[PDB]
Amino acid sequence: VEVSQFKDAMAQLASAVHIVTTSGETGQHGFTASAVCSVTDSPPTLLVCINSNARAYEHFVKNRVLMVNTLTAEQSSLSNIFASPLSQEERFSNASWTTLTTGSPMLQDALINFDCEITEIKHVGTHDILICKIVDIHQSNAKNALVYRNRVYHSV
Amino acid sequence: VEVSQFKDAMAQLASAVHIVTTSGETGQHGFTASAVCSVTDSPPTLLVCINSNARAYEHFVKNRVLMVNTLTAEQSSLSNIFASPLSQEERFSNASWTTLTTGSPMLQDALINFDCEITEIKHVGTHDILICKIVDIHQSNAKNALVYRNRVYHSV
Fold first, then answer.
1. Fewest CB atoms less than 10 Å from the CB: which of A15, A89, B19, B129?
2. Are the beta carbons of A45 and B13 separated by less than 8 Å?
3. Which residues of B touch A8 (CB under 8 A)?
4. A5 touches chain B (CB under 8 A)
5. Would you call A127 helix, strand, or coil by DSSP?
6. InterPro entries this protein is in (chains A, B) (predicted)?
7. What distance in Å separates the CA atoms of residue A72 and residue A51, rounded to the nearest whole number?
């Protein structure tokens, strides 16, 4: 199918919004993602799709850990910031961060935080699939989720 | 992490809802899925996670094509029907279906329809990842999406 048609069809597919981070000597690194889903509960595992040409990519390959920080309805600016060509220092300055187990930065006031080991990497052309065993979780209660659909944000 | 904690954390992660189908001599087969996301646009590709122990599974392995039918806000009963131990005949009787290119059943009145070839299969324990090249698309306009979060349905 044509790429434009696929992009317009994908614009219809509602998705949760996450900021996926990792830790480095280069310091903190992260990116906004929608292509995240659970895989299995034996053991709890999720996947994250990543552009293998992105600035982000080799930090994830090198470290082999990541945090999935699922965003609340109040964090749409942060979503945009982590999707845009800003330095990591500027990006991270816009929220508060800690760590769980891996050292990957945990976003404070997030909807959910899944700290993961990148167990394996599969190549799918311009993107890779990161298979991620979950090793620590923090969850919120009574918060609303950020959702992206029709190229705008929503509260669910 | 504990499975119960992971399930409760996943309950917070908003997701689109899809009915994933394929075609057979055994006839039509399908299942409700949330673990679906785009992968790449070179060429347009999505993935679908499937329980390799499910009744559904070997039909997908045998046929090597599937349709992702993304649901509208009006199709929550259909979502439940395709998640429950009903015969495929009973399931399919509850909507209208056609075909695009692969013969996988296309759900009428869906939000989006992605007809796919299952290019490769990766094993991740109890689940597999189906890598799916998109070969035909139908999209709706001006409809609302079904979203699942906190174990209940939503309109986005």
1. A89
2. no
3. 139
4. yes
5. strand
6. Flavin_Rdtase-like_dom, NADH-dep_flavin_reductase, Split_barrel_FMN-bd
7. 24
